[PDB]
Every structure is written in structure tokens, then in C-alpha cells.
Amino acid sequence: GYYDEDGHYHSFRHGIHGPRPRPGDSGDSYLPNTVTIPCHHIRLGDFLMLQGRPCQVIRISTSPATGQYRYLGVDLFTKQLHEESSFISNPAPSVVVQTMLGPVFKQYRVLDMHDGRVVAMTETGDVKQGLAVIDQSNLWSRLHNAFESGRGSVRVLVLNDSGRELAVDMKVIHG
Amino acid sequence: GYYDEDGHYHSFRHGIHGPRPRPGDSGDSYLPNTVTIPCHHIRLGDFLMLQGRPCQVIRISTSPATGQYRYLGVDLFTKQLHEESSFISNPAPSVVVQTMLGPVFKQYRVLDMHDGRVVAMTETGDVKQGLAVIDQSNLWSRLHNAFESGRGSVRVLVLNDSGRELAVDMKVIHG
Questions:
Q1: How distant is the Cα of A142 from the closest Cα of chain B, in angstroms?
Q2: Which residues form a coiled coil (chains A, B) (predicted)?
Q3: Inter-chain contact A122–B93, Cβ cutoff 8 Å?
């Protein structure tokens, strides 16, 4: 959300007139561990919540019925196809944004990579044994190359599907 | 921001440990009419707050000193160059996001386009006389073409620089 010039907070979880549901809101827009993303910042390959599921976007189009953006995606866990249209947020007069929901990632350190899985560490030292790596975009190979050349620098980006955890991307921290 | 599975709100306006400033936060991250944008969703040409100024991004690079993203941009109002690095948000354990600030746009209807300026209407009927159109990306020509072919469908995206208003993009509402 944002603050206006008078100090009032406005949330893009609000539809046509933390934040709480108001008339015109969708209960779908308050899913936990999700952030609102304006549609113009969404590109092919991005990760989005489609029908409540974490998906990789593979098609962006416009619905002729409504004129809003429509997103086709592949479930990161089940590999099923999902489809969802944007929802129109109008938090304040003349502020109208087509929005989508995206997942919140957790960053873990990588301690070991063996038998197709990683041993990861959370920020607080919690050791994650047998963390699966998504078979997508050659992630395991790039993860393992960066691991072999510098292990304290490698992080996995992890999503949680009601208890089932998946490393879906990586990051190399520099500086 | 987002909600965790327990109902607690978390804001990306928080640095290294509506929302209020905590220890480790930057006061810069609470500018009014700004939204937090994760750095991986930022592309060349996007609109960002750089040094507190609304800018068009023209270069994205990584700082060797800090390893964070660095953004070069052109002020939309003054046409001056501005430069700013991302700030690291850590709202919760293992949630670490490089973020930037972006402006909030207002959508106005277009009633008239003459002498290089538009007459606009806010959502509530407030008439904006003599609204300037940014000389950027052939906006005036595309705005005027869409206006001549369908006027109730055309919207300008407007930014405000401490009272000085500027139409910096357009949208054609369909459906």
C-alpha cells in the first residue's frame, strides 16, 4: 500500500469502493504470504498466485469480456495449468490499479547438495533437511555450480505449499 | 506488505531488524504516495523514486561496494539525472528483499486536448485545466490518436510534484 499526503494508509487489497476487508473487496486478495503486484510490472516467467496456487506465468493476454489482464500459468508444485484474471483495486479517488497476487519467498543458506536435494539453513539456524529443488530453468545445475565455487554466497528461494517446501530459485549474495 | 499464516502484517518498509518506523528503518522508505517494489520486478523504462524524485529508469547495474542494485534515472519533471541504490528489507526471519520505491499514479478522464495540454476530469468530477503532457515516448501523439477515436475510453496517468501536475502515461480502458 501507500500513505497519502495526510498520513492515511491505503491498501491495494481494496476493490471497488494491516488492512481489513471492506465492501467491494475480494476475500481472495487477503491470502497469507502474498503481496499485491501491479499488472504492468508482471512479465512472462514471473511467479504469481493463480487460483490460489503458486504458478509460473506462461501467457499474458486481455479478456475481451472485461478488458482486464488474464494470466496463464503452470503450478510450481503440481505442474497443472491455472488461469486467473486481474482484480481492479480502487483504494482512493482516481487511484485505479489492475493487480495480481504474488508469493513471498524465504531465503535459506545452502549447507549441502546431494541426491537431488539440498540441506538448507534458515536465518535463525533452523536446518532444513532434504529440501527439494524444482526441476525448472536448469536451477539445480546453476545452484550446484555456484555452490561449488562459493557456498556461503549461495541462497535458495523457497516457497511453502501447506507444509510442503520447494526451492524454486536461487540468489548469489555479493558485496 | 503481507500477512503471515498467523495473521500478523509485515511491511517491506522495514530494514534490517499502517506501518511505523522501527530501529533499522530508513525514513526515506515512508515517503507519501510511494509503493515498495521488489528489485526483480524492475525493468528499464520503469518509473521509480530516485533520491526522492520521480524518474524514468535508464540504467540498472550492481554496486561493487555493496552488491545491491543501482538505478540511474531521468527526472520526469526537471530532466536531471538521479542515482539511487536499493535498500534491503528484512521484515521477518528469512524474508530478505531488495526493494525500491515507485510513485502512485492517478487516472483522469480526458475531456479536451488543445495547445499541447489536456483538460482532465478526476474520478469525482474535478476538472483539471491546462494539464501538461510529458514530452516522452510520443505520448501526446498516441494520446491524441486514441482520443480522436474514442474519448470516454482514454485516461491519462498523472503524477504530482508538490503541486505541479504532469500527465506521464496513458491507458485505454476496454471491456
A1: 18
A2: none
A3: yes
